[PDB]
Every structure is written in structure tokens, then in C-alpha cells.
Design an enzyme around this catalytic site. Structure first.
Site, PDB file in Angstrom:
ATOM      1  N   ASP A   8      58.011 -34.309  71.941  1.00  0.00           N
ATOM      2  CA  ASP A   8      58.000 -34.046  73.997  1.00  0.00           C
ATOM      3  C   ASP A   8      59.384 -35.812  73.802  1.00  0.00           C
ATOM      4  O   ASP A   8      59.913 -35.904  72.931  1.00  0.00           O
ATOM      5  CB  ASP A   8      56.205 -34.494  74.464  1.00  0.00           C
TER       6      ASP A   8
ATOM      7  N   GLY B 162      59.452 -44.731  61.069  1.00  0.00           N
ATOM      8  CA  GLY B 162      60.748 -44.736  59.176  1.00  0.00           C
ATOM      9  C   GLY B 162      60.149 -45.746  58.519  1.00  0.00           C
ATOM     10  O   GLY B 162      59.470 -46.576  58.672  1.00  0.00           O
TER      11      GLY B 162
ATOM     12  N   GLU C 272      52.260 -45.321  69.621  1.00  0.00           N
ATOM     13  CA  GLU C 272      53.371 -45.999  68.525  1.00  0.00           C
ATOM     14  C   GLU C 272      53.156 -46.254  66.862  1.00  0.00           C
ATOM     15  O   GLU C 272      51.426 -46.909  66.893  1.00  0.00           O
ATOM     16  CB  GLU C 272      54.239 -47.278  68.231  1.00  0.00           C
TER      17      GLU C 272
END
Ligand SMILES: CC(C)(COP(=O)(O)OP(=O)(O)OC[C@H]1O[C@@H](n2cnc3c(N)ncnc32)[C@H](O)[C@@H]1OP(=O)(O)O)[C@@H](O)C(=O)NCCC(=O)NCCSC(=O)CCC(=O)O
Ligand SMILES: [Cl-]
Ligand SMILES: [Cl-]
Ligand SMILES: [Cl-]
Ligand SMILES: [Cl-]
Ligand SMILES: [Cl-]
Lengths: 255, 266, 257
Positions: free
Chosen positions: B140, B165, B188
Site C-alpha cells: 500500500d 532490509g 515497522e
């Protein structure tokens, strides 16, 4: 000095300035001030005698640069825009980018009048006019460096971090992240808060001037400034009656 | 010769490699590895025997691909960039896009070396090199899929969600979102946290390896993994003296049919 | 052969199984296109407040959904930025005259879809506005904010950096997310799933509201869901568990002006 005096007089006269009605002297002082900001030769705030000081006249020049320009079409097709502030890298080729010493990862954008130092990496992100992003700083994906903000050397602005702009009020210092700080993902630091060097914010720390900063070591609340070396995490303080808590920032250690 | 073997030796020799001197054997192996990642023929980590396994040599190839290229100008008009990793779609025509089976909503960008499966929708978002986004997943607006991250099938990454990452250390598994998970807006998940299948994170859940995950039903604190079928919401734990609390993640219940209905309603 | 927009759309909705880009009457395609046109210009809106009540026009949502079914994905882009989608962007082909008439600013790299209304004196910092949204006069959409599908944003609203306003297209009957006039939505906040923030309210940074979020009124001790009453100042907080071992986050109304 020359620029400052001209800018200050133009500011007092700003009601009579428009994109079609401005003298050469005013236009040139504003343009030269924006040029100096873009190159880092001028900066909105700097640290003198261990205290950050703001140059109101430079903020006045930035605000005048808005008043002196009409919006104009920029771009084409699915990426068509309409604004009065140029982007920083329009027209740059290999020589200009190689000289700057930084990386601009698509689709990152900065405005002209923001300074980007050598060895900075702009992942997709936004850097607004007047900001200063010093050497070695990483600006991660969907981060924002707002207007006039001062970002030190070797700072890590993690994903989705917002550094709030402060153009008005003129008298107010901008948001400052000092050297070597790590600002965790989704955090926001706004409204002239100063995060001193070597500090670490966990993910999701939101600091304005009104945010309570609870120092676990002292049991005391303070505001507006993270002391150097502090590790700051989200937490809360209970109401007197125990019915609820309100979120705050908590300093859990200082290194 | 063996692709992995070529890469492993170049990694040992990496100090002497640059964009102006590297054997054809080396450049070809790195490029072929990135090509395999871009196509989904290779992946940085995969699930084998119920465990996620990382392929260090593929990460070595990704890192070498940075060392082997200089930054280059790219862009048009007001949007001008300078970087050493190509975007994924710069060379795609309509036939390539039709064949991929996914949608890329302006101004979404992915890097070359990210795999996007069929029936994915990339709203404006970023997908970094080495990431794998499996079938049917929704990414999104202003979400991020970071380097090497593995996103399962039929996942919903809501607005502003960041999947962190992981490249270095080479042995570290990437961040993993398993199949059929819902990750609520602004959440997150970073640093190789694994969100197991059929889990739901509410808005504003922030997970790293050091985040306390408090299971309400058992009172136990764990780290690094959301067990399959968990509903995770933001909460906190009080200090021993009661003066304050520190935010943490709380497993409040297991995903039930009502949870499913609420995380598919729109 | 040609009927009003609503009737043509409702007719086509019942046949939506038999509808595709290749097979679709000119009447149906024109009706869908004209409904999107009306949304784009603010002549139509997915929801509006009538008699002090927000009501939804299901037929307009039907048109938006049909617009997806009737269009294939298409290539678009420039240079390294290449895309593939079935909804056009709003400003494709605009020159100076179109933008001057709109009266708003679009700061690069902000993007909006066709079918979103942007009123005069709006500033779109880099941000996204999805189809069916209505962004009223004087509103500021700050950097990396999102106005989702069908959301209604009032006049003189400030959506701060990284704010998300959630889309609501399905279910047809559900009202969209609504931010009423003069609200300030602090950075990183999210308001989704048809929550209504009533006029003159202030959300601090980091307030996340869905239909499931407890809204705790500090003055009364009452918990409610789905609506921020006018004038409320809302901050993040939490409520303790019965045994005192932990708390769960919620929104707290700390005062009301
Ligand atoms: C996480 C969920 C899915 C929860 O789903 P469920 O219906 O299973 O849970 P629930 O019964 O509502 O909540 C279980 C317990 O957690 C608490 N709780 C729920 N959401 C919370 C939140 N965000 N933060 C903190 N606590 C929360 C409830 O008060 C309740 O406490 P008690 O047990 O003490 O009562 C919710 O946040 C939600 O509706 N999210 C999706 C909203 C959205 O954006 N949907 C888009 C559609 S996507 C198409
Ligand atoms: Cl200091
Ligand atoms: Cl209180
Ligand atoms: Cl503690
Ligand atoms: Cl959206
Ligand atoms: Cl509880």
C-alpha cells in the site's frame, strides 16, 4: 552585510512585492541568498560558541522567494506538477553530481536551496528548502528533512523518519539533529527540538516541544532537547488515579 | 564453472574489484545472479523444512553488484537522480509488464533485482534489491519492502508499513512476512524479525530483534518472531516501581473469523 | 439510448460479470467516464453531509469499481520511472491554464489519481490522493501523507507529515473516512475504516484510529469507538489491564474546546 540589509528592507516592504513587481536589487538579493543556501555557504542556523543561533534574515529570504515566483508547470505525463520552488537537481549532469559527492536514489527529490554534503545517500525521500544535510548522512526511504532543519554528520535517519520544518515563526530555531545520531524508523522530531550528538531514538519516538521527556535516571520530565548520548524509547506515564497513561518519550540510558 | 563458486571467489577478492577492472567471468556471474533475482529464479532466502535458509552467496553477489558499478545520472525534467542501481522497470515495455501479471501504480519504484509475483499491486511504494514479493500481495501507499525481505503470498502491507532490509551480516536471515498476514498501517518490522503465517499486526506495531513481545495469555516475553495466528497490538509494560511504562508489542489473542473479516473489509 | 448517469451505472452494475475492457457498450463506458469526470471536478462526491448527517452515494462507488473493470492496465512513465496501471493520473496533459483554473499547488513528486477532487488553495506536498477522494479548500497535505479512496477532507485541514487517511470503497454501504473542517492531524497519525473526526479537532502525533480503537474520554472515563467529537484534542495513551501486568494503547481525549 550587503545581502542581509537588502533582505530586511524587502521584508518590511513585502506587502508591495509580487512576481511582477519587484526591483532588480530585491530579486538579486533573494536569488543570491538561495544560491548560498543551495551551496552550503549560508545556513539558516549554525552552532556558535556551543549554542545554535538562527539567521532570521535568511528565513526572510526563503519566504520572499515564494512571494516573488508564480507557480509553473513542471514535468509531464504521469509525473506532472505545478509549483513555484525549483527542484535542486534539475539540469544536473554527470559533472554536477560527481562534484557534489552524494547519491540521489530514484524517486528522491530535494528542493533548490537545500544543502546536501558529500557522502550523503538520499534513498527515496524529500529534502525541503533551507535544510542542511551534512557529510556521511543516510536519509532512508520515505524520510523527510523539513525546511531549515540542520542534520549533522554521520546521522542515520531511518525509514519513514520526519524532521519537522520551521520557517515560521521567524524567531524560532529549526529542528536540529546533531552529529552521529541514529533516529529509528517512523520517529518524528519537530518544532525545533534539538537531539544532541551521539543520541539514539528507537522506532516510533515522536518529539515536539510539548512532548514529555521522562529521564528514567532522575524521575524528572523535561522538554525540547535530548541530551548527548541519550537512548530514547517510547513509553508512558500513569495518571495520578491509575485509570490510564499518556504516551511520552523515555530516556533509558545515556552513553 | 559454478556460479556460486565464481561469486565466492570474487567475494574473497573483493578488495581488488572495481567498475574499471573485473574479469568478464566475474561481471557475468554477478549480472546473471541479479538477473535470476529479478526473475524470481533465485531468492536470497527460502523456506525449507519449516525453516528460513539464507543463501550467503546471493547476498555476496548483490554486494558485488554495488562495487562493480559507478553512479550514473538518470531522470527527466524536474526529477533527476544519480545512483548505481538500475530501477527495475526502466527497460520494460508493455509486453514485459503484461507478462509479469502485476500492477505498478505511479509513482511506485522498485530496483532491478527485486522479484514481484503475479497479482501483486504496488501502490506508490518502494521495493529494494533482493526483495521477493509473492503472489497476490498488496503493497500500500508509501510502504517499503527493504533489501532481501521476503513477503509471502496474499499479504497486505498497509499504508506506510516498513519492512527493514538486511544485507550484512551475510549469515543473517532477512525480514520475513509469511503468507496471509495483515500488517497494519505505520507498522515497522525490521532486522530479520519473522512474522509467521496468518498473523495480524494492528497499526503502529514496531518490531526489531530487541522489542519485547508480551503474550497476554501466558505472561511470557519473547523476541524476534510473531507466532503464526497471533494478533499483535501496541501496548506497554510497567516499570518495577510503577513510575512509568515502556512500549512493547502485545499478543492479545489469536486470529479469529472476526479478525479476518475486519482485515479484509475494505 | 442515453439515460442519466446513476441509472446507467446501476444497470451496468447488475451485469458487472459480463463486463470487461473489450466488451462494454459505449453507453456504459461513457457513463462511467462521465461519473469519474464529475468526481474529478467536484461536481459529484462519494459522500456528503446533508441535514447534519453524512450520507454515501453507493452508485458513485459502483461507477468507480466499474471503471477498474472496464480498463486494462496501461504503460506510462518517463525515464527510469515506469509504471503500469489502469487508473490515469489526474494531471496528465495539464498545462498552465488547467492548473491556474484549479487553484492548487502540486509539489514534485506528489501524484493524484483522476477522479480525486482537489479544491482551490490546497497544497499537495509530496503525497498521494486516491480516486474518489475530496480535498476541500485551503487544506494542506504534507510530505508522504495519503488521502485514500473516497475519503472526505474538509476545508482548512492540516494533514501533517506521513498522515494516512484510509480508503473505503467496499463495502458499498460504508461511509468513507471523514476529516471535517479545521482539523489538525499530527504527523504519523492514521485514521481509517470510516472513522469520523469532527470539526475543529486536533490529533497529536502518532494517533491511530480504526473502528476497533478505544477512544478514552479522560473527563468521563468512558470508552467509545469510531468518532472524535468536535473540538476534541486527542493524544496517544493507554489503559491498564485488570491485573496491572501491562497496558494496551488507545486514543485519549484530554480536552475539548
Ligand atoms: C488488530 C485488529 C484487526 C483486531 O481485530 P479483532 O476484532 O480480532 O480484535 P478486537 O476484539 O477488536 O481487539 C482485541 C483486543 O485488543 C484491543 N485492541 C484492538 N485494536 C487495538 C489497537 N490498535 N491498539 C491497542 N489495542 C487494540 C481491543 O481493545 C481488545 O482488548 P480487550 O481484549 O481487552 O477487549 C484491529 O486493530 C483492526 O480492526 N484492524 C484493522 C483496521 C483496518 O484498518 N482495516 C482495514 C480493512 S483491510 C481490507
Ligand atoms: Cl551537544
Ligand atoms: Cl492524564
Ligand atoms: Cl522500565
Ligand atoms: Cl491510498
Ligand atoms: Cl488487557
Amino acid at each position: 552585510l550587503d545581502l542581509q540589509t537588502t533582505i530586511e528592507q524587502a521584508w518590511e516592504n513585502r506587502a508591495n512585492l509580487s512576481p511582477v513587481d519587484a526591483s532588480a536589487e530585491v530579486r538579486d538579493a533573494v536569488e543570491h541568498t538561495i544560491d548560498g543556501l543551495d551551496l552550503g555557504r549560508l545556513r539558516v542556523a549554525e552552532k556558535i560558541d556551543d549554542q545554535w543561533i538562527v539567521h532570521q534574515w535568511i528565513k526572510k529570504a526563503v519566504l520572499l522567494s515564494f512571494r516573488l515566483h508564480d507557480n509553473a508547470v513542471m514535468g509531464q505525463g504521469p509525473l506532472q506538477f505545478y509549483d513555484k520552488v525549483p527542484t535542486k537537481f534539475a539540469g544536473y549532469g554527470e559533472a554536477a553530481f560527481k562534484a557534489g559527492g552524494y547519491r540521489v536514489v530514484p524517486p528522491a527529490v530535494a528542493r533548490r536551496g537545500a544543502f546536501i554534503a558529500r557522502n550523503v545517500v538520499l534513498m527515496p525521500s524529500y529534502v525541503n528548502i533551507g535544510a542542511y544535510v551534512d557529510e556521511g548522512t543516510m536519509v532512508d526511504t520515505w524520510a523527510t528533512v523539513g525546511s531549515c532543519a540542520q542534520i549533522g554528520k554521520n546521522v542515520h535517519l531511518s525509514g519513514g523518519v520526519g524532521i519537522g520544518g520551521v520557517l515560521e515563526p521567524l524567531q524560532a530555531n529549526p529542528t536540529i539533529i546533531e552529529d552521529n545520531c541514529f533516529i529509528g524508523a517512523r520517529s518524528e522530531v519537530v518544532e525545533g527540538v534539538v537531539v544532541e550528538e551521539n543520541s539514539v531514538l528507537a522506532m516510533g519516538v515522536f518529539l515536539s516541544q510539548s512532548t514529555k521527556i521522562y529521564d528514567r535516571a532522575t524521575g524528572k520530565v523535561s522538554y525540547g532537547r535530548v541530551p548527548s548520548g541519550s537512548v530514547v524509547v517510547p513509553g508512558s506515564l500513569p495518571s495520578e488515579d491509575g485509570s490510564h497513561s499518556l504516551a511520552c518519550a523515555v530516556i533509558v540510558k545515556r552513553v
